[PDB]
Amino acid sequence: AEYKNTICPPRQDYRYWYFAAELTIGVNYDINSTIMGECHMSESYIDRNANIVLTGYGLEINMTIMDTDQRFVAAAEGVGKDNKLSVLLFTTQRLDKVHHNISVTITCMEMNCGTTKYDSDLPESIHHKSSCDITINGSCVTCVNLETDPTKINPHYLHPKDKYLYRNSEYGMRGSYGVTFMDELNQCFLDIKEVSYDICYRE
Partner 1 sequence: VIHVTKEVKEVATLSCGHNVSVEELAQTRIYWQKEKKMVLTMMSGDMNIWPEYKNRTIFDITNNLSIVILALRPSDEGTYECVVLKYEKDAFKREHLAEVTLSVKA
Ligand X SMILES: CC(=O)N[C@@H]1[C@@H](O)[C@H](O)[C@@H](CO)O[C@H]1O
Applying CB under 8 A, the residues found at the interface with a copy of itself are 1, 3-9, 11, 14-16, 29-30, 58, 93, 108-117, 139, 164
Q: Which does 103 bind (CB under 5 to 8 A by kind): ligand X, partner 1, a copy of itself, none?
A: ligand X
Return phi, psi of residue 173, to 5°: -95, 0
Please enumerate in sequence order all residues whose Cβ is within 8 A of that of 13, keeping only pairs 6 or more positions apart, or say none: none
180 vs 188: CA distance, rounded Å: 8
Q: Which of residues 136-175 bind partner 1 (CB under 8 A)?
A: 171
Return phi, psi of residue 13, to 5°: -130, 140
The yes or no reply on residue 178 touching partner 1 (CB under 8 A) is: yes
Q: Which is nearer to a copy of itself, 17 or 192 (CB)?
A: 17
Q: Contact positions toward ligand X, by CB under 6 A?
A: 32, 51, 53, 62, 64, 101, 103, 105, 130-131, 161-165
Beta carbons within 10 angstroms of residue 57's beta carbon? 22
93 vs 142: CA distance, rounded Å: 32
Min dist. Cβ of residue 190 to partner 1 (A): 11
What are residue 144's DSSP bridge partners? 25, 179
Min dist. Cβ of residue 37 to partner 1 (A): 32
> Which residues contact partner 1 (rule: CB under 8 A)?
118, 120, 122-123, 125-126, 128, 171, 176-181, 185-186, 189
